[PDB]
Ligand binder design. Structure first.
Ligand SMILES: [Zn+2]
Ligand SMILES: [Zn+2]
Ligand SMILES: [Zn+2]
Lengths: 274, 63, 68, 199, 199, 198, 160, 159
């Protein structure tokens, strides 16, 4: 029920086999329990479940102790802060539960406890996240987790010495040798459109980032023994594959020396999008 | 069963329904929230109290 | 008296009881299987079923709340 | 019309689910850690493209039944307009009556999305020759959609439910040959009135 | 007349949003990178056309309800000047009463618009037959418009809110049959007078 | 059109190990075990199955002289003109057989047991290392389905031959030590593609 | 030494009697200022720097009519194609050959040309022959004169 | 407003100097202090103990740290997995990171062994335990530095 004043229920009866009885009281039966908004008194011979009882004494206990099948809860209303409290204490003594009147709240924390002043309680400092359908209550280890996430993403966004004019000693081979080598290493699938595109992307962020990219694709891992080039398409021998990878390294490193217009005009004959 | 009915208690003998739902009320201010890592989050320092039919998170003012 | 049969059909995943219930059921179950074989009525389970039941048997005592 | 069929679909993953990231900024800002990101919302849920799976399911099924359904899967195909898939999912002239939502998850990407490690194993060394990482959605994760047919014909639930069994036996998105994307659908249909907001 | 109902609409994207670029110069200078650019300002914010969505929602729902409304959506179809959508949104004679502003985003393109890979997969061989790039507004972007009804003949706010519920269910923008454009509106009306600025 | 539906049922005749791929599950378990099993969030056990069938048919058909490519060597591009590229896939044209993950018929707490493994020094005969790893019991039943989309004739025969190869060598990991010896049972049917249409 | 805070300080919570908010941004340094600018600033500066780097045969006169009629009917040459062809023709003659080579460029990895696929049941060799016919027809049109190229392409795309 | 953050780790993007940050803007009496993740952990412990109440690292220089880490990564005592787990426990806090390195370096009295990976290459037992103690001292001396410098040291050995 919604204790607006004037109550509410769910139909939105503002106060379903309803039946009236003299309060000298409305009996709203629902499939979800048979409510009884007693109203003011100053009784159904059947199943009650919830007794919305207006407290404003012994007469209320007499009224309660004549309902067959004593109610599960007794919402106390229309009284002051002390009146609904003292009637509540008396009804708790008669072994009947009282209740003195969106997004789900899902607590994701521990269950340690205490028995403090007849109010079982636990100290928690934490966080309250609000997902669309819920408001989770989670601990600080969650905050450490999202902090490690944001740190391990934020430190991967400025690689340093990027988009900046500085500096080298890069090798040298003519524009016709760079063209021939990139042609051969595009026919055999070592230099690909993704490789050329990522090389241009890391070349725009400085010469140094392109050197780091190319030494990251040419690093033969000391454990596995696998460079991160795409393997060649053909029937080359192991020494020949090593020489082809070395030619790829030297060609791309030599292309880093040339200016950006020349690198673009060399590398849009093999991958049109950058 | 007849004597338990006499003591005003419901009996379902094994030949034959209120929706009890323990709820978790929030009871703390939720207006001042922030977003850090695509999460609407808010730090609080409070007390989790375990009442019957109701687990209430309640601020320091309650304590 | 029907825990090892649920272990046989693999419908049970934890068997929580008191420690004294565990130790007493390690007499009752063996005695039931002994009676079932000695009365020559197709055994409701086996001794293996009893042993596997005590393999998935956790024990907790009085006034100790488990959160499962 | 005066009625609109609203099919409320609830999908539960029975296998790990992967549908890969389409947003190039998000893919290029997640291929620093995971080689196969999943497509995610900016509200940190998981999107799955649903319409094309339904159209593909009914196209494969109704070309096998012997009906006159066209193929809109071949490259730059023109949808004809005179079949049931063109009536339900759309032609070049007309638009489809079924307005299929995405399969947005109910939970966020820290309760459903895990990073896995897949391998490529050499056959004469029985050892890893490649390692990659991938993002995936856990089993028992719940996604929701709502197909909304605007001019409701009769065989329009029995076609969208017959496709939803085809997307139970085949898969919904991603690496469906390895075993991913095996799901289960639950349909609670309803034919509302079009003017149900006016009243 | 003497007062003006000032509806203030705030829309949040619950799904990816697409409304296409109308500007030929901006579109053709985007086909180099993206095949489907979004409608964007020269202030780098995203425009969505709103009036026609409201008028389409009210005309469809009001034809369904049994009220007499004109169809200003057909080729060579004139308005009536006697319907309630002809009073609220207008005819070829009398002007409209609601001056529906554009749904302008609260953020810029660099924070809401992402390029995204879209596919056409062959139904038989289960492999991509076409690829294209679209732009899409992310989920959680907030757009703001302002409807302003002059001569506020009561039932205006109810009709506008019913049309916003229709747009919430159906979608605003393009690709509305694939899951795109699912939104959530937030009305904050008012009735401030015409003479308000006079000092 | 039709489709083949090969239902496979696998009973473990040996302890089985497949390592957990999910990093969060591996980190959470790796405070107790040193080698977790690949477990579903529904507490079932998930073995990969496509790679085993593909590797089985690749190793077998390379011995019969048939032109099959290698998709196991590092970053190898599949050919597209082989039986393994037809039934399991190529770069363009997906594999006709959708092979499902071998999900157990029973839960983690009935078929998965923590085990203690050792490393014994060869000259003092004393345990130098101890590592706990999870293993699937002998008798656990794992069910998968193989869904061949455009069915040819030899697909069921080659899948059954691959299943006999996995019956000999094994599924999962630690295969050199005796782990993963499993038995496969096959029930195939040719279902119509339009069998869901009423 | 002067510090400027360019993060919005509105959505701020309260913990430990202290008002606080978890912020996720970038400390920037200049010759006179140490500022705290958000991720949005770094997106603006990154796209600004990336944009700064980016800112650095012979047939008949009736054979062509019948060919363009056939390729318009089977939907491989369309009003869009003709519009882009006329736009590249106004840019010159080598650019029209460049555009037509780019459209006819068969990708070696997929075996596809950027033409529209034909309507009707055609064999793959017939589709390749129609691709070659479109390439040769428009390449032959690049050798005619402007008024004539207008007169042949009109009756197909009257807007352009 | 006041910066309580070390202004080191300043890179050079374009013609600007930047440092990637993640922290807390505390406000008090117009000081508006831009603190770090380390103030808030202390302040969190202050409130946690307030609620729950009412109911010396060796200084090795940076070059020595880099040299010892390079040698101990090449004799395969400091592995990539070891460096990653040290990074995780350093993220969890300095005390957890000392606890982790103490756990790894602890010679069990029963087995006589430590949880470091054994040195690859031919050594003697005294040399092997000296290399183990060098691993202990180098990582404990790494705990002394701040998170950004530890990240920059360890990213050149385990990316
Ligand atoms: Zn069609
Ligand atoms: Zn009208
Ligand atoms: Zn092959």
């Amino acid at each position: 029920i919604k204790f607006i004043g004037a109550f509410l229920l769910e139909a939105k009866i503002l106060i379903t086999k309803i039946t009236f009885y003299n309060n000298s009281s409305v009996f709203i039966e629902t499939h979800n329990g048979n409510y009884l908004f007693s109203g003011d008194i100053g009784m159904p011979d059947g199943n009650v479940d919830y007794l919305i009882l207006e407290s404003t004494q012994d007469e209320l206990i007499d009224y309660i102790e004549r309902l067959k099948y004593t109610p599960y809860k007794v919402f106390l209303v229309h009284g002051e802060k002390e009146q609904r409290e003292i009637l509540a204490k008396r009804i708790i003594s008669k072994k009947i539960r009282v209740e003195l009147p969106k997004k789900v709240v899902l607590n994701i924390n521990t269950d340690n406890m205490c028995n403090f002043a007849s109010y079982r309680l636990m100290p928690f400092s934490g966080f309250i996240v609000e997902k669309d359908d819920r408001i989770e209550i989670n601990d600080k280890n969650w905050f450490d987790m999202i902090w490690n996430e944001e740190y391990n993403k934020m430190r991967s966004q400025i690689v340093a010495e990027d988009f900046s004019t500085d500096q080298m000693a890069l090798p040298d081979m003519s524009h016709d040798k760079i063209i021939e080598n990139i042609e051969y290493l595009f026919n055999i699938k070592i230099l690909s459109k993704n490789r050329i595109k990522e090389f241009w992307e890391e070349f725009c962020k400085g010469q140094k980032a392109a050197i780091k990219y190319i030494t990251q694709v040419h690093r033969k891992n000391p454990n596995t023994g696998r460079r991160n080039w795409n393997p060649p398409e053909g029937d080359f021998t192991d020494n020949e594959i090593e020489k082809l990878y070395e030619t790829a390294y030297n060609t791309l490193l030599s292309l880093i020396k040339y200016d950006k217009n020349k690198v673009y005009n060399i590398l849009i004959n093999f991958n049109p999008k950058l | 069963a007849k004597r338990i009915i006499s003591k005003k208690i419901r009996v379902e003998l094994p030949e034959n329904e209120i929706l009890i739902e323990k709820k978790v009320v929030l009871n703390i201010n939720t207006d001042n929230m922030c977003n850090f890592a695509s999460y609407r989050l808010m730090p609080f320092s409070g007390f989790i109290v375990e009442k019957d039919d109701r687990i209430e998170i309640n601020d320091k003012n309650w304590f | 008296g029907l825990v090892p049969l649920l272990v046989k059909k693999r419908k049970v995943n934890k068997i929580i009881s008191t420690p004294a219930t565990k130790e007493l059921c390690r007499l009752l179950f063996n005695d039931f299987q002994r009676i079932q074989e000695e009365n020559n009525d197709i055994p409701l389970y086996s001794y293996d079923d009893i042993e596997s039941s005590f393999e998935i048997w956790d024990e907790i005592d009085d006034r100790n709340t488990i959160e499962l | 019309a005066k009625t609109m069929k609203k099919i409320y679909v609830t999908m539960k993953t029975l296998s790990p689910l992967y549908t890969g990231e389409v947003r190039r900024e998000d893919k290029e800002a997640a291929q620093k850690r995971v080689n196969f990101p999943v497509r995610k919302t900016a509200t940190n849920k998981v999107l799955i493209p649903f319409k094309g799976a339904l159209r593909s399911a009914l196209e494969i099924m109704l070309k096998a039944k012997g009906e006159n359904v066209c193929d809109t899967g071949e490259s730059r195909a023109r949808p004809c307009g005179r079949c049931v898939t063109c009536s339900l999912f759309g032609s070049m002239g007309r638009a489809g009556r079924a307005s299929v939502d995405f399969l947005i998850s109910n939970d966020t990407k820290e309760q459903i999305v895990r990073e896995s490690t897949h391998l490529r194993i050499e056959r004469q060394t029985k050892s890893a020759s490649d390692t990659f990482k991938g993002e995936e959605v856990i089993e028992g994760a719940t996604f929701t959609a709502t197909i909304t047919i605007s001019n409701p014909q009769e065989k329009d639930l029995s076609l969208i439910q017959s496709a939803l069994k085809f997307i139970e036996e085949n898969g919904i998105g991603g690496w469906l040959n390895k075993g991913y994307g095996r799901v289960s659908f639950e349909v609670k249909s309803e034919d509302v009135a079009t003017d149900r907001f006016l009243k």
